[PDB]
Amino acid sequence: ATRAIPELTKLLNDEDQVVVNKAAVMVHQLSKKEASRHAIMRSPQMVSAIVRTMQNTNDVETARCTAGTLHNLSHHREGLLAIFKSGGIPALVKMLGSPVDSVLFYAITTLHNLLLHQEGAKMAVRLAGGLQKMVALLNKTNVKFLAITTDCLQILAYGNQESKLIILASGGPQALVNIMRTYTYEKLLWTTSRVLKVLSVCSSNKPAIVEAGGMQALGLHLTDPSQRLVQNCLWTLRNLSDAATKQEGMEGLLGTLVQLLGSDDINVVTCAAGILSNLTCNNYKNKMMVCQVGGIEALVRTVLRAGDREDITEPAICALRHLTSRHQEAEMAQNAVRLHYGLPVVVKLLHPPSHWPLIKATVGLIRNLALCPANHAPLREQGAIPRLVQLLVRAHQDTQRRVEGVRMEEIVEGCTGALHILARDVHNRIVIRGLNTIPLFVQLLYSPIENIQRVAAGVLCELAQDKEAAEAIEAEGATAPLTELLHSRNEGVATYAAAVLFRMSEDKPQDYKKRLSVELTSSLFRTEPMAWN
Structure with missing residues (x-):
């Protein structure tokens, strides 16, 4: 079809439905021939003819044959290109709404090869x-x-x-x-x-x-x-x-x-x-x-x-x-x-x-x-306590001097919370107390993070139930910070603060305990406007 194409090109443009039909069938026939195939996907006048005829035709076969031809063209670079820079994509997309299945199938598969191998086809299909x-x-x-x-x-x-x-x-x-x-x-x-x-x-x-x-x-x-x-x-x-x-x-x-x-x-x-x-x-x-x-x-x-x-x-x-x-x-x-x-x-x-x-x-x-x-007991026998305390000490230092997807404060709160719970056990308490954690827990009472203050005061509360630990907590200077935490907006923090403060004074004179109670009562009873400061 070296020079037989131009004739068909004109035949496709005809105004007689029977005339275009014959041309359409021929062009399709030639598309199956890897020889005359190139002759078509090389004549922009022809490719445009196929495109236009496919879109503006009421003859079932003509539609199926032009759609089928483009499909045969989409197997080669020039074919895809020729279809692309010819308004084929918008054309083929309209055909996606065809009532005839073969046309539907030819349109979608042709578009498929265009999306996979033709540069800029994706945007075109989207926009169309x-x-x-x-x-x-x-x-x-x-x-x-x-x-x-x-x-x-x-x-x-x-x-x-x-x-x-x-x-x-x-x-x-x-x-x-x-x-x-x-x-x-x-x-x-x-x-x-x-x-x-x-x-x-x-x-x-x-x-x-x-x-x-x-x-x-x-x-x-x-x-x-x-x-x-x-x-x-x-x-x-x-x-x-x-x-x-x-x-x-x-x-x-x-x-x-x-x-x-x-x-x-x-x-x-x-x-x-x-x-x-x-x-x-x-x-x-x-x-x-x-x-x-x-x-x-x-x-x-x-x-x-x-x-x-x-x-x-x-x-x-x-x-x-x-x-x-x-x-x-x-x-x-x-x-x-x-x-x-x-x-x-x-x-x-x-x-x-x-x-x-x-x-x-x-x-x-x-x-x-x-x-x-x-x-x-099982966690304790696995060395959990020393490890948790070591991670807390480490995470705390990195906090008071300065990681990989997590804030060190989160580690401080997590470890202290775990120890707070573990300290319910008489034996874990003595180990926790023995690892000199009291000064650390006291430092955490100064943390600006409410949750850390809660677990810090909490573990100190667990530790304070034993007289010796309560005395040590006082010695490390916990009174001032706990006294301030009594005013915390977090009642959990405030209650824990009251418990340790009262634990430390269990042995003071009745006169001193009475005064402390006035402070706990004035502090824990929320009245007047909350945000009053």
Whole structure:
């Protein structure tokens, strides 16, 4: 067709429907020929003819043949280019709304090659309103067609904030989630999971996916033979997990996640640990269920297997911290960590080479574990107290002289809080007192952070129940600062201050105790206007 093209070009522009039809069929025929193919994708007059005819024609075959030709052109650079700098993209997008399937299929696949290989096609498709049309097409039922379409969505949305916003506005989340729990065609499930994965990192799309049943839908494929599918579902679940605190019907997913903690795939275990951590954060129902399916045992094993792999231990420890507090079975979980040999490894994580993030989380877990008396002796025998006191001393110095994702004040508060609890035990108290912590705790009474003052006064209160410790607390100069804390806006701080102050004066003359009481009463009884100062 070296020089037979120009004739057809004119034939396509004809005004007789039967005439264009014949030309259209021929041009299509030639597109199948890698010889005459170039002859077409090299004549801008011809390419434009195909484009225009496809758009402005009422003949089924003509539409199918021109669309098909462009599709054959999209296999080569010049083809893509020729289609691009010819207004093909806007043209093909309009065709996405065609009532005839073959045209629909030719348009979407051609657009697909354009998005993947033609520079600047993404923006063009976006501007032409392709996204809006592709999302609406998610109601079709041909799984091979849904695969290419959803894949087009993934290509457009990847790293493109605005595309994601458009997909959300078009109901993209609900349609993608419907696909995940409706079809079994592995390739469609995988391409869709990839779109959901890309959207899941967006604060705007996250709530919509969750509300649409995304968490549960993705849970259904965690035990699927397809590895790549299970993984994308995991990465996606992890991204959505901090926004799924209000979901119900989560039992199956949680059950599966626990089981997945026993996988030999670091990526699967790491995600299962992260998802479980987020899903149990402030959700008693999820904490309850995770515990019922042996969540504690599984988590302890994971922490044991991970060794110094902090990308695994940190999330696992965080889940353990959540499962050991604020729910009906928290006490059972606190005991379970011990019964499954978790204390030795948990305490071990306080020592190097752990980093502040893991140490912070570990300290929090230890503080919950200490709520259970049966853990006092075991934690003590693992060297918990000296280690916690050493981290506190260290974190405190760095504070009074000046890290890696965490404020040292957080460590000071965490360690002091853990010790406050551990000090309930007669033996831990003497060790804590024996490590010369009193002067440190007294210094913390001057902290500007209300929570630190609370745990500081609190541990001093525990220590003060023993006469000798109470005398030592007075000797270290705790009276002045505690007297000031009596006026604290935090009643917890104020009550602890009153307890230590009165502990220190238990042996003074009745005259002195009476005066002190006047001060405690004047200070702890809030009257008149609060903010009066």
